[PDB]
């Protein structure tokens, strides 16, 4: 109980290296009241996640809702993949994400009115600020493109890029039957054929459970120089150039590497996507402080610690929104160069920008970061139609709606087949 | 969904008929041995708790350390708020929580009766050493802090730290007779402003050269091109470059101030080791584990190995012939002049072997400083296995409560706000 107050200075100390003035004393009594209503369709859609560590697999369970002016909408998703620490959460992150993603597009054109919305839980900036990648991440890709090269690897972006136009239809016309759907992620059922197409060609057995590659004839793994010493860079390059550079690799990070290519475009593609809807907004009771403030877009308040501000100094407590002048953008590294020509959408983001809004619904209620593609002027009105607490109502029905038992028949199944050992 | 359970399975069966091979190196027919035979023992068992709440953009986490043996029970605890930042802000708090047992651990042997003193992790030690337990988030604001007070002035902030951190586990220990429990287990907090009024703002946005190498920049990929620059050069000294490259970084104060609270509590996290390591019988179990980097020598993670040797053909324990040393550079070289019981480890290596007490118990995952033999038998008096029960039991979760105790008090003082996001 000692620390009980080190806390409370710290949250102090916290909140009053804001009450200090950068140019948000003025921008408080900015603060704007809320427009009238304006009548609109909406749907909103949250997602939970259920995973479970079995050994060194883990085994997740994705469900992802849209409730709203249409009928209810699902999908759904169970697996297992290799546990890590960055990257097994990293994986499952992006397909709870995608699912939502897919989701808030499908619903979008289920939708009618003269004024349609989509209403997503989290915020914009999230996925391109530290988006569910790391550095790691990356390297999945620069490492599968000098790998496979830059002509099969386009082969295999393109190739993978249409199945999953295929696939939005497929999974499309099944929410319009069953208003669920049990299969909505791609990935993890075509990387296989994918592999034996794009890279077991490429490749040859090598010592224990490793694989012989030949580099294509631009960027080559750092490996290259390692492999090469008593040599000058001209026989590096002379070896390059006439083909017999080669890699000795393991079978598996080649694998993953290529899954996480995989799961990593198919993410990319529904942001694209849902990028499609018109006006589409963001809700959240929290972004963050550090991590944005200091994003090199300048500086955020973060709600929490801004409304506290608020009744403290000018004693308002008044709902309203203030809205962040100068609209966002994404990084270029977040992002690659040659990725983007395939997403349009993604693209107009980087250079058309994101607005953003605290937006307090209520009395004394919460500040909210309400992120959105379109002026907050335009959809905020849309978006106040729904309100009913110091909320908005389908938001408060798509995420109490969205949250066990399931696991432990899936303890109860590889009998059938082979053993129980590992669950136990 | 019906169809994936196929899917799941398979995933799985792969996986196990992959361990169908020839990385049996086969011994598991023989080299298992059964158990090597009780031994008088004196012991302790410690394991970790934490509860962590989201306030907003302010983390708060609650840590509770228990050690049971023969002996009193020892409780260290803490309580904390700190700026959450994606990932490190669970790195962070699980640092803590790894401070907190080795530090416990230690202590405990250092009170304890007897011609034999055993202390039992749980945990792996592997896990702790492959790659820092913050990644490389560390190692960079080490750097930082190095480059930017310079070489010298840092190692006597360095061994000035050192110093003050057996102030601590004296005191510590003070409390931990009279009352056998402290609240201020971690001084990484009640220090850290002094050491940069000392150690910082005496000097000090400012410009900072640094390793490309520090923030875990190169392997990756290069383009073409930077070969074709240096054409006309060897290999070898290309390597150098990318090597050698340094690159600014322009620090507020926040960075400057943060480098500082991750280094020292990089180098405290380092200390409870260190010490614990001193201990002369030291036992890891743990059950399940990160196996990735460890066939990076081969191995398989232990419930994956039994439904094996089932499939194949009783208790007893299964030996790993050769030691395995953990990384040298994972540590940076101006640190390991400061602790030998680490230095030591990577010149000697850890020893692991698969252990199983009943009939239908899985086998879990042993680890020692000094090889298995002497050891396990040492553990196998104190079999149930009790002591293990009981350090984990009671460390677990004592209730939530003690998190949604905090907020009614702090609007006793101004603003609430943050106490309800
Ligand atoms: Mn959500
Ligand atoms: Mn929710
Ligand atoms: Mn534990
Ligand atoms: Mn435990």
Do not use: C
């Not at 999908?75 to 097994?88: D, E, P, Q, R, V």
């Not at 849902?274 to 972004?287: C, D, P, Q, T, W």
């Not at 991590?291 to 929490?304: H, M, S």
């Amino acid at each position: 109980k000692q620390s009980i107050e080190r806390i409370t200075k710290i949250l102090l100390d916290e909140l009053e290296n804001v009450r200090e003035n950068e140019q948000i004393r003025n921008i408080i009594n900015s603060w704007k009241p809320l427009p009238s209503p304006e009548k609109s369709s909406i749907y909103a859609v949250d997602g939970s996640r259920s995973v479970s560590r079995l050994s060194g697999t883990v085994i997740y369970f994705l469900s992802a809702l849209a409730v709203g002016s249409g009928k209810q909408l699902r999908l759904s998703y169970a697996n297992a993949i290799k546990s890590n620490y960055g990257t097994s959460d990293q994986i499952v992150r992006m397909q709870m994400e995608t699912l939502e993603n897919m989701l808030g597009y499908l619903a979008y054109r289920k939708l009618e009115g003269e004024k349609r919305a989509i209403l997503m839980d989290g915020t914009l900036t999230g996925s391109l600020v530290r988006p569910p990648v790391y550095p790691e991440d990356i390297r999945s890709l620069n490492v599968m493109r000098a790998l496979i090269g830059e002509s099969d690897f386009e082969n295999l972006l393109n190739e993978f890029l249409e199945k999953l136009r295929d696939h939005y239809r497929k999974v499309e016309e099944h929410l319009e039957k069953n208003g669920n759907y049990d299969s909505p992620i791609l990935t993890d059922n075509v990387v296989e054929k994918l592999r034996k197409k794009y890279i077991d060609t490429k490749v040859i057995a090598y010592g224990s459970g490793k694989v012989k590659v030949k580099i294509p004839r631009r960027v080559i793994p750092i490996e290259v120089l390692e492999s090469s010493r008593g040599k000058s860079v001209d026989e590096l390059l002379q070896e390059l150039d006439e083909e017999k550079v080669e890699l000795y690799l393991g079978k598996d990070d080649i694998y993953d590497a290529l899954h996480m290519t995989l799961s990593y475009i198919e993410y990319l593609y529904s942001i694209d996507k849902l990028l499609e809807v018109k006006n589409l907004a963001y809700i959240a009771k929290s972004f963050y402080t550090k991590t944005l403030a200091r994003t090199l877009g300048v500086e955020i308040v973060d709600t929490a610690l801004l409304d506290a501000v608020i009744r403290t100094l000018i004693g308002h407590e008044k709902e309203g929104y203030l809205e962040i002048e100068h609209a966002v953008v994404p990084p270029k590294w977040s992002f690659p160069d040659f990725l983007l020509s395939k997403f349009r959408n993604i693209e107009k983001l980087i250079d058309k920008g994101i607005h953003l809004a605290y937006v307090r619904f209520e009395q004394g209620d919460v500040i909210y970061m309400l992120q959105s593609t379109t002026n907050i002027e335009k959809i905020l009105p849309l978006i106040l139609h729904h309100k009913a607490g110091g909320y908005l109502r389908p938001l408060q029905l798509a995420h109490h709606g969205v949250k066990k038992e399931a696991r432990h028949t899936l303890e109860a199944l590889i009998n059938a087949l082979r053993n129980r050992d590992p669950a136990l």
